[PDB]
Amino acid sequence: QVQLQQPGAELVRPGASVKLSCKASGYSFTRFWMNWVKQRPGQGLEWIGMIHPSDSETRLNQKFKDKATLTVDKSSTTAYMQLSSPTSEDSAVYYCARKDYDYDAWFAYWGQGTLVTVSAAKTTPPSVYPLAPGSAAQTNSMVTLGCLVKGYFPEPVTVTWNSGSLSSGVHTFPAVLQSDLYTLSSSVTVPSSTWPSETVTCNVAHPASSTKVDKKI
Amino acid sequence: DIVLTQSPASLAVSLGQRATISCRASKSVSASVYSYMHWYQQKPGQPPKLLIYLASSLESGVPARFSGSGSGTDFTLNIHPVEEEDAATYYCHHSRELPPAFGGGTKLEIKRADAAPTVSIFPPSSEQLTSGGASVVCFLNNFYPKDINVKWKIDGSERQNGVLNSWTDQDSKDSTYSMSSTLTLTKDEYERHNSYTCEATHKTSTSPIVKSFNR
Amino acid sequence: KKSTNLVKNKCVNFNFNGLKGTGVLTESNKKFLPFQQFGRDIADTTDAVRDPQTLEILDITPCSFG
Amino acid sequence: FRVQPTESIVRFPNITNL
Numbered sequence: 001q002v003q004l005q006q007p008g009a010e011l012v013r014p015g016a017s018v019k020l021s022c023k024a025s026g027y028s029f030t031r032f033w034m035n036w037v038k039q040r041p042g043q044g045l046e047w048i049g050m051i052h053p054s055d056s057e058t059r060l061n062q063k064f065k066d067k068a069t070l071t072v073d074k075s076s077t078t079a080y081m082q083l084s085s086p087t088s089e090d091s092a093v094y095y096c097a098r099k100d101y102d103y104d105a106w107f108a109y110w111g112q113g114t115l116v117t118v119s120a121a122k123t124t125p126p127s128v129y130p131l132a133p134g135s136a137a138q139t140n141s142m143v144t145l146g147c148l149v150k151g152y153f154p155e156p157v158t159v160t161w162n163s164g165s166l167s168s169g170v171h172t173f174p175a176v177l178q179s180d181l182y183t184l185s186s187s188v189t190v191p192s193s194t195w196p197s198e199t200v201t202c203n204v205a206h207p208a209s210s211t212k213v214d215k216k217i
Numbered sequence: 218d219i220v221l222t223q224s225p226a227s228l229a230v231s232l233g234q235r236a237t238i239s240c241r242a243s244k245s246v247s248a249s250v251y252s253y254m255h256w257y258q259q260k261p262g263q264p265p266k267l268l269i270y271l272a273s274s275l276e277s278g279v280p281a282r283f284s285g286s287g288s289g290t291d292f293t294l295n296i297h298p299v300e301e302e303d304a305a306t307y308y309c310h311h312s313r314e315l316p317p318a319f320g321g322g323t324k325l326e327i328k329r330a331d332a333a334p335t336v337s338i339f340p341p342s343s344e345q346l347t348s349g350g351a352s353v354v355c356f357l358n359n360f361y362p363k364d365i366n367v368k369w370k371i372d373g374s375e376r377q378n379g380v381l382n383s384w385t386d387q388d389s390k391d392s393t394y395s396m397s398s399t400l401t402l403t404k405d406e407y408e409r410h411n412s413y414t415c416e417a418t419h420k421t422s423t424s425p426i427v428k429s430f431n432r
Numbered sequence: 433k434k435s436t437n438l439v440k441n442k443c444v445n446f447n448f449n450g451l452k453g454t455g456v457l458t459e460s461n462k463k464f465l466p467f468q469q470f471g472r473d474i475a476d477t478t479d480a481v482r483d484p485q486t487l488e489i490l491d492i493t494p495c496s497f498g
Numbered sequence: 499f500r501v502q503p504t505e506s507i508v509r510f511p512n513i514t515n516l
Contacts, residue, residue: 031437031505037319045308045319052442054504059441061316095264101438103488104271105312106255110264131339131354133430144337148354148399171358171395176381183381185397187356248461249489313459315441436508445506454503484511498499 002026004096004111008207011154014118018086022079022096022111029077030054033099035107036070036081040092048094053079086118117154121180123209126152128202130217131185143190145217147202150183152209159186159204166190166200219243221309221320230303231328236296238323240309247288253313256285256294260305261386269294301327302389329392331421334360338415338428341407351407355398355415355428359391366418367398368425371410376400438483443495446481453478456493464489 005023012018022034036048049060053072060068069082083090093113100108131146149157155175169189175182190200202215222241230236246253251271259265267276272285272292282300287293296303304327309320335358341351357365363384369376381399388394398415414429438457446453451470460480464471466487473479480491 031439033439033441044322047317047319049316050441055442057442059315099312101440102486103251104253104255105440106267106270106310107257107265108267110266113264127345127348129342129345129352131342133337133339140335144335144356144358146339146354146356148352150352171385173383173385173395173397176383178381183352183399185354185356185383185399187358187395187397189358248459250463251488253459433508433510435510436506438507438509439505442505443501443503445503447506447508449509449511457507483509485509495503496499496501498501 002098002109004098004109006094006096006111006114008112009115009117009154009156011123011208012086012116012118013120014087015085018083018116020081020094020114020116022081024077024079024098027098029072029079030074034072034079035097035099037095037097037107038092039095039113043092046092048081051079083116086116088118091116091118115155119154119180121153124151124153124181125209125211126150126157126204126206126213128204128213128215130202130215132217141192143192143195144187145190145195145200146185146187147204147215147217148183148185149202149204151181152206153180153182154208155182157184157204157206159184159202161186161188161203162198162201163203218316219246219311219314219318221311221318223307223309223321223323225323226321227324227326229326229328230296230299232299232301234297234299236294236299236303236325238294238307238309240292240294240320242290242311244314245290246311246313248313252288252292253311254292255310255312257308257310258305259308265308299327301392303327304387304389304392327387327392329361331361332359332393333422334358334365334417334419334426336415336417336426336428338413338430340413340430340432346404346407349404351402351404353400353402353413353415355417356395357398357417358395359393360395360419361393362420363394364420365396368416368418369398369400370414370416370429372412440490446478446492448481449484451478451481453481453492455495458491458493460489460491462489462491 030053033050035050038046038048051058051070058070067084072079096111097107098109099105126149129148171187173185175184205212219242256269257265268279268283269285285294304325307323338355345351384396411432416425416427418425440457470481478492
């Protein structure tokens, strides 16, 4: 089975180097092209460039010339991409896709994506707080619960309820940047025969800081 | 090169209707009786997927409600019958020339009948009050449309500063919206104020939905 | 033996139904009649070829200049 | 100058009968 893997996110200061990894498995890494796609939120998709892994020959867009650099390692079958002096406008989501050629060339498969955030802010562990009203006045037969995660950097973090046991009623909200910090408020809706019986927990993991926080409501 | 232009940017198609998205090319991409085009679906937080290739075929695993046709520069891509899970961002691509270009994108909104929102104000916990600050969070779920007015009242006084709001995309199942309103405040502003009030103003409700609690 | 896929943008060896050649596979805007196998120019070299499995027309762009 | 090819594309007709 063909599967492409990329890291979740990477933090870099302006003026440093950015190194990304695209792992290929199930197909020959040589015979097939490796294409890169830049997705900036609100700007749509953008075409980075292509590279032929056998001869290292690269094809770069006119706008990304002299900036992006493509290279491949044929021993571990992993393609790399670098960016010289990334700036604030270079923050985006990067994909690596494979072209399966039958007549016209389309994108058959995609990667998970890596968020590159360029900011001078330090790595901060998150502060996670439970949210309960404390009393029920029988206003509804369904109970709303929430976890507030604030003061985390870099974005994103992965939030779940009881390690992903409740897949229904989950609502995860995106962050708003304030004071070089991020905040979110994850909410779930449980029935009334659950919360006096079971305890629903906030299970949040930040893979950039390697910090896993379990909080009880 | 060839620059792709898509119109409109935001298309609203309800259940039982037909959607139309036009991808224009500066030059003719049609060659060898066929044409070079591709159309993708990208959901928030998920990579895009192939649906219809070369307008003449349907990819395996893709439902039959997606169809495509057209020749020359301007292409037409149709969807029918539309389903509640069809809301996503759509793109178009051409591999003929080089360096290739990507489309501008089109957001598809699925129309739904209006529902009253679930409004819940939650007090700040005792874990936050050790650190010196507090945050009051009002959750607003299951509402349509996106235009809703959020107001905060501390003891009858309205403060529009220091509030944060955050919106999401349309759900695949419920096809509604959810948001939060967070207010950050200091412990010295928590000691002298007893009541916090979340207020939501909607088009369907004449009376705004008021929620309050006592410290 | 085993069939292979297509690499369009690179100079590679071409063996199609026994016909040998080397060049670049490019998009062809020329119209061919489906009843013909391939076609050649006045130089007795193959300028285009049709894929045996899927119906398509691709041009052979010469490589190895110098 | 000379440009030596690298990969090799071999396409044979889809076999209905060997």
